[PDB]
């Protein structure tokens, strides 16, 4: 009752998203209609505020249906990439976005909150050059065609107790996609996703990932592929970038770089904040 629905933005991971106007403040928001532990978990996310996290304005439980009211941003990274397809995103903008995302992740991760489902459609961008993580923490609160392209290998191999490393893996994949203008691992099934990772990074074994062979969905029968070079996977990215991406894509989640450690990487020595070129 307190909103006017302006337009259907589309059908997100958990239900429909609407651009809406608050009838008692005039503020324009994103309203997600979600299709009691969940209420408590979600309610805690109202406190998780950071400039690179899309702000959860409010949570409204009524007719025992659930509405999440979020800060509105006019574009996402998926559409920005599609619109930059001919030309590519300039490196300093790639670098700025990656840095800001890592700040967001470092913040949530220092509170033990993970995203678990990062994807370009979840990264929202404004006119001032800011990029922000949307739907943060909703996977744990509500559980999760859905995209597998960004999933870490420990999730695909059936680990129940994965860690903040899963987000760094996703963000690596998005980094590589910004650079190349093609998804890194566009699997169309769980095994196709796994085998696309293995074809690129080599089939993992006990040498690179202690314990891998005891994971729930690991099979001794997986084909055995050798690793390729990152010079072939993300050209023409420079050696700092490739060094960072390689650390974000380590098979072992314990050796994978943390968001905080990544913010200190030399790739970011010369980071700036450009303003993107955006048509709304």
Ligand X SMILES: Clc1ncnc2[nH]cnc12
Catalytic (active-site) positions:
117
If one asks whether residue 56 binds ligand X (CB under 6 A), the answer comes out as: no
Task: Return the structure tokens found at 63.
Answer: 């007719």
CA 7 to chain centre: 25
Alpha helices in the chain (DSSP H): 37-45, 77-83, 91-110, 138-142, 153-156, 165-180, 190-201, 230-233, 239-248, 259-263
**Residue 258: what are its φ and ψ, rounded to 5°?**
-75, 155
Three-state DSSP class for residue 22: strand
Part of the chain binding ligand X (CB under 6 A), chosen from 57-65, 71-79, 145-153, 158-166: 71-79
Among 134, 173, 174, 262, binds ligand X (CB under 6 A): 134
Residue 119 annotated in ligand binding: yes
How far apart, in Å, are the Cα atoms of 46 and each of 60, 66, 163?
Answer: 12, 15, 22
If one asks whether residue 70 binds ligand X (CB under 6 A), the answer comes out as: yes
Residue with Cβ nearer ligand X (134 or 179)? 134
166's CB contacts (< 8 A; 6+ apart) are: 114, 116, 151, 152, 154, 155, 253
Residue count (the chain): 280
Among 71, 190, 240, 252, binds ligand X (CB under 6 A): 71
If one asks whether residue 54 binds ligand X (CB under 6 A), the answer comes out as: yes
Please say whether the beta carbons of 98 and 106 come within 8 A: no
For 174-196, b/e burial (b = at least 16 CB within 10 A) is bbbbbbeeebbbebeeeeebbbb
Three-state DSSP class for residue 194: helix
Residues binding ligand X: number (CB under 6 A): 11
If one asks whether residue 72 binds ligand X (CB under 6 A), the answer comes out as: yes
If one asks whether residue 17 binds ligand X (CB under 6 A), the answer comes out as: yes
Query: How many Å apart are CA 209 and CA 70, to the nearest integer?
Result: 39
Part of the chain binding ligand X (CB under 6 A), chosen from 68-76, 92-100, 183-191, 266-274: 68-76
Residue with the closest Cβ to ligand X? 30
If one asks whether residue 9 binds ligand X (CB under 6 A), the answer comes out as: yes
Part of the chain binding ligand X (CB under 6 A), chosen from 9-17, 87-95, 231-239, 250-258: 9-17
Restricted to residues 239-278, the positions that interact with ligand X (CB under 6 A) are none
Residue with Cβ nearer ligand X (73 or 139)? 73
Least distance between ligand X and beta carbon 227 (Å): 37
Task: Return the structure tokens found at 119.
Answer: 């994807």
Residue 76 annotated in ligand binding: yes
Among 20, 30, 133, 157, binds ligand X (CB under 6 A): 30
Annotated binding residues, written as ranges, equal: 9-17, 32, 71-73, 76, 119-122, 135
What is the contact surface with ligand X in residues (CB under 6 A)?
9, 12, 17, 30, 54, 70-73, 124, 134
Annotated binding residues for Mg(2+), written as ranges, equal: 122, 135
Annotated binding residues for ATP, written as ranges, equal: 9-17, 32, 71-73, 76, 119-122, 135
């Amino acid at each position: 009752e307190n909103f006017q629905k302006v337009e259907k933005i589309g059908e997100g991971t958990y239900g429909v998203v609407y651009k809406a106007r608050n009838k008692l403040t005039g503020e324009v928001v994103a309203l997600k209609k979600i299709r009691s532990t969940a209420i408590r978990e979600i309610s805690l996310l109202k406190e998780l505020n950071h400039p690179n996290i899309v702000k959860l304005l409010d949570v409204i439980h009524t007719e025992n249906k659930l509405y999440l009211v979020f800060e509105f941003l006019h574009q996402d990274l998926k559409k920005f990439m599609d619109a930059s397809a001919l030309t590519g995103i300039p490196l300093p903008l790639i670098k700025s976005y990656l840095f800001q995302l890592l700040q967001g992740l470092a913040f949530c991760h220092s509170h033990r909150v993970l995203h678990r489902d990062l994807k370009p459609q979840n990264l929202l961008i404004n006119t001032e050059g800011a990029i922000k993580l949307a739907d943060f923490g909703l996977a744990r609160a509500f559980g999760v065609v859905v995209t597998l392209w960004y999933r870490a290998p420990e999730i695909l191999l059936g680990c129940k107790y994965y860690s903040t490393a899963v987000d760094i893996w996703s963000l690596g994949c998005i980094f590589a996609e910004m650079v190349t203008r093609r998804a890194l691992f566009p699997g169309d099934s769980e095994i196709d996703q796994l085998f696309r990772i293995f074809r690129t990074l080599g089939t993992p074994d006990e040498v690179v990932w202690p314990g891998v062979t005891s994971m729930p969905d690991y099979k001794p029968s997986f084909p055995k592929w050798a690793r390729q070079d990152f010079s072939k996977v993300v050209p023409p990215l420079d050696e700092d970038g490739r060094s960072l991406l390689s650390q974000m894509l380590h098979y072992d989640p314990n050796k994978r770089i943390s968001a905080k450690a990544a913010l200190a990487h030399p790739f970011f020595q010369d980071v700036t904040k450009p303003v993107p070129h955006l048509r709304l």
